[PDB]
Subunit: 148 residues, 4 copies
């Protein structure tokens, strides 16, 4: 079976650079990869991935998954079932601290969860877990609460 | 502020014994804790209020799958008040669908711990799913890897 | 091949309990385990030397659990490796650093071998925060800032 | 105080880019950082040479290929943590004969966080390589493949 890794955290936490880190490890090992965003194939629906996935593909990499429809749950469970490893990067929470549904569903399915931190825009510590509106900023919980 | 740790995985993955690892650290430290299951046995997340005091430094909640998704805001508020929260629950049902309350708390978590069980079928330390099977020997629930889930279920 | 998991942290960081959390999952799963501790599966076999483990391991044994590894001879590194090569999962708990913040060598060597590392924290004795990573001095668990205020 | 993160694994498991990724997060957050090897990056022979490149401003220090530094790096890193500086180190945990690299082992002891990286196994093509093997070239392999090839 393939395994699912989900990388998550606020804006500016290094999510996409983590994602393409694994992309690099797979390419180095000479595994065939397919990379998607909402060199990546820019797609509207999760059902568009099949067209860029070959019999040969052993890794599928997905960026900004919060923006995909939740049907990506089922398409990823299917790739896993076929023995394809899947890596997904996206925001866990909105700027109002509500979950992004597609990331939540993927977090439930994940074999491995990576939570990434950012530098806090207000206090400067490497301890920021949240995204705050106004342009977007990454902040820790305490700073989020004092800023609104 | 408080930080949220979420322990999850399939049945028989040791998630309760794990959250007790955490209760104990706090007791050893002479800290006041409040422990909940669906340890006080409550029905609604809004009932935690009654058992949490001004010097409660840690909140521990088991079987989180069985609570209403309002637990998300209950926990968010505890974190903002500086109280550390530890939650254990199942991530997926025997049909491999997400439990909503667990999925919400994983989005909010500072730290996620994914637990594995022993695969009931192939024997390896690698089971991530729960499956309902015929219960003639010991309907029953078993923990399986994905390969074995697909073979059996 | 077997997998190595190492749990480390200061005193009072719940390392022993985490180790039993792993024993019990093998037990529920009907796997045969062997549990060891050093001379300072329901029995913890108290043994002096890492080479003494072989006498309690049957062809059948699928997981090996070792507590307080800092007190074992560093030969534990080769004995654990052999166990991995024979398809047996090993889980080890111990202190990473002495009360003087020097590495415990055996725990150090096991960390380089580990497939998985779990770093555990205690409640800070001075501080009250869930952030102690160090042991001090009675022994007391403390965060790095309080360790420096106290000594 | 600062916190120590140690990134480890076999060759081609992506340690260097993992470390640089943490550099980028810091640089974007407008923290002053310094990088070292056996935002300015310095090549240094001894760990004690970091001292002259750390300013009162410096909030992150990033150190690569740590298996080649003297074990004295442990106490240099301890001092930096004690002065409020965060430290990220990346280096090989095991040599190609599966003996510990001493310097990494000690930093693993000091670490607050440990990241173990995996490579794709050169022999069986899986994402499960934890070991390095001299074959002269070096390759990454799982334990099972290592023992199959020697
Ligand atoms: Zn802040
Ligand atoms: Zn199985
Ligand atoms: Zn303290
Ligand atoms: Zn292999």
């Amino acid at each position: 079976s393939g395994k699912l890794t989900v990388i998550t955290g606020p804006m500016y936490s290094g999510k996409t650079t983590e994602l393409l880190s694994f992309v690099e490890i797979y390419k180095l090992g000479k595994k065939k990869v397919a990379v998607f965003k909402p060199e990546a194939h820019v797609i509207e629906r999760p059902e568009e991935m099949r067209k860029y996935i070959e019999e040969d593909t052993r890794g599928v990499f997905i960026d900004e998954v919060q923006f995909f429809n939740p049907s990506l749950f089922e398409v990823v469970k299917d790739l896993l079932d076929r023995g394809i490893d899947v890596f997904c990067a996206g925001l866990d929470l909105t700027h109002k601290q509500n979950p992004f549904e597609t990331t939540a569903l993927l977090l439930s399915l994940a074999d491995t969860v990576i939570k990434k931190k950012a530098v806090c825009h207000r206090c400067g510590e490497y301890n920021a877990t949240l995204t705050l509106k106004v342009k977007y900023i990454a902040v820790c919980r305490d700073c989020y609460n004092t800023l609104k």
